[PDB]
């Protein structure tokens, strides 16, 4: 999270850290007791490693009462996702068991109505990703309020040049942005999850490259099928 500030500890109970060999790899969102939503490209260069989901965390290094590291029972990427495309960049992780819920661990409701978040709407994005251009990752959870950018502005040649589909959404990126390590993380508009970060190899905090988020509402039937 670039140009943001530290999140109040445990104020986002749905926040998860998708880990590879005990190191933060991607953001994640607890959507059901045993299921975490993240991005498919997160698992791309893992193959050998121990994939785990850390819940009720604020600090990645420091012990906290609520912090519990969970093993992964099942990894369900979207069936149509693959390595060469930003399309369908969603991943459903099944925890070793149902999550121990409490004040710091609780699932988040996701947008079911397939209609765009109005341009200008202020949304909240959190994650343990890079905070500057030097690649510095934070110890504690960071967040930033971002205005939703309309698809037409986002599709300009200066920006994403037509790459923004109806299943993707945009947010402003001028010196306040999602970055490397924030992928799989949540984009929340009015307490409801609207998008899952899909950063990739996009430069961050540059007004010329707006932030890209997968619209959860577009994948309503698929999430229900995996969770049922």
């Amino acid at each position: 999270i670039l140009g943001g500030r530290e999140a109040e500890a445990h104020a986002r109970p749905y926040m998860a850290s998708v880990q590879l060999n005990g190191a933060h790899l991607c953001g994640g969102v607890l959507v059901a007791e045993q299921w975490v939503l993240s991005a498919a490209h997160c698992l791309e260069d893992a193959a050998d490693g121990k994939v785990q989901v850390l819940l009720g965390a604020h600090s990645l290094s420091q012990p906290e009462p609520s912090k519990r590291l969970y093993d992964v029972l099942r990894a369900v990427p979207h069936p149509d996702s693959q390595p060469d495309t930003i399309d369908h960049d969603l991943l459903l992780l099944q925890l070793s068991e149902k999550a121990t819920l409490g004040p710091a661990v609780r699932p988040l409701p996701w947008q079911r109505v397939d209609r765009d978040v109005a341009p200008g709407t202020l949304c909240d994005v959190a994650g343990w990703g890079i905070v500057n251009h030097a690649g510095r990752r934070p110890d504690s959870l960071q967040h930033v309020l971002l205005p939703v950018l309309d698809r037409a502005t986002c599709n300009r040649r200066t920006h994403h040049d037509g790459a923004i589909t109806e299943r993707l959404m945009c947010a402003e990126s001028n010196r306040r942005d999602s970055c490397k390590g924030d992928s799989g993380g949540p984009l929340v508009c009015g307490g409801v999850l609207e998008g899952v970060v899909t950063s990739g190899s996009r430069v961050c905090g540059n007004r010329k490259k707006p932030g890209i988020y997968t619209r959860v509402a577009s994948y309503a039937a698929w999430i229900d099928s995996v969770l049922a």
């Epitope: 341009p119 309309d150 698809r151 037409a152 502005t153 599709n155 300009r156 040649r157 200066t158 920006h159 994403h160 040049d161 037509g162 923004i164 589909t165 109806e166 010329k208």
Partner: antibody
Framework: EVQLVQSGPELKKPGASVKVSCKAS????????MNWVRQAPGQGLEWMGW????????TYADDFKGRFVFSLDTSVSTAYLQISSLKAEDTAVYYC????????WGQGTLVTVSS | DIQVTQSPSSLSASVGDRVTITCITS??????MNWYQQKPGKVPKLLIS???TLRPGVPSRFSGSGSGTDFTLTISSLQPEDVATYYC?????????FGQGTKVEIKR
């Protein structure tokens, strides 16, 4: 496939106004904005401005502020250019260019301003 | 509004020659330079987009270079069909801005 089809040539008297249409097909009209370009006879291309097809917001190049208005009709996926208080110097080919993706242009519209 | 200065106004070269056209912006624009080709009675054709990206169905003899302020369009081996007016367009921010154009003729 993507198509941008503009209305036919028009002759207008000085002081009158003109409305040029740019009918878009083969893509989601609101996913891409529309640019307007003018080419006076034997002159260079002039970027007039843009219209955001999702929000209706407009940005005009300095030379084009005032007498030039971009508008939309989302129901028919059409972008419009309205030029008021026409003068001899407005005699030009007016193009619409879809902003972003595989680059697409309308065929142009010759507007002649004469008595 | 960002200003662009295209050069030269016109040139003449033989088949096989190398054509060099330049555009200088009033500010640092990064990679956001475009090049268009316009044949006599035809609509403009985008040849090169930002980052000096060649467009589909554009011959490889066309190439772009430069960053920030100083941009160049190169036609490595001038062909008869290349006779046209060439325009650069800066797309850093709105409003976008065209160069004055360069008319390219063939010396035969």
């Amino acid at each position: 496939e993507v198509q941008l089809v503009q209305s036919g040539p028009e002759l207008k008297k000085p002081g009158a106004s003109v409305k040029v249409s740019c009918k878009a097909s083969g893509y989601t009209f609101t996913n891409y904005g529309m640019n307007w370009v003018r080419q006076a006879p034997g002159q260079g291309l002039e970027w007039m401005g843009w219209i955001n097809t999702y929000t209706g917001e407009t940005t005009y190049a300095d030379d084009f502020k005032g007498r030039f208005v971009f508008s939309l009709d989302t129901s028919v996926s059409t972008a419009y250019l309205q030029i008021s208080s026409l003068k001899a110097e407005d005699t030009a080919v007016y193009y619409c260019e879809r902003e972003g993706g595989v680059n697409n242009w309308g065929q142009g519209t010759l507007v002649t301003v004469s008595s | 509004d960002i200003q662009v200065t295209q050069s030269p106004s016109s040139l003449s070269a033989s088949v096989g020659d190398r054509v060099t056209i330049t555009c200088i912006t009033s500010t640092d624009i990064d990679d956001d330079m475009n090049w268009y080709q316009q044949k006599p009675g035809k609509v403009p054709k985008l040849l090169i987009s930002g980052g000096n990206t060649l467009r589909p169905g554009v011959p490889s003899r066309f190439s772009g270079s430069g960053s920030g302020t100083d941009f160049t369009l190169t036609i490595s081996s001038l062909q008869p069909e290349d006779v046209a007016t060439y325009y650069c367009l800066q797309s850093d921010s709105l409003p976008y801005t065209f160069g004055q154009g360069t008319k390219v003729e063939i010396k035969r």
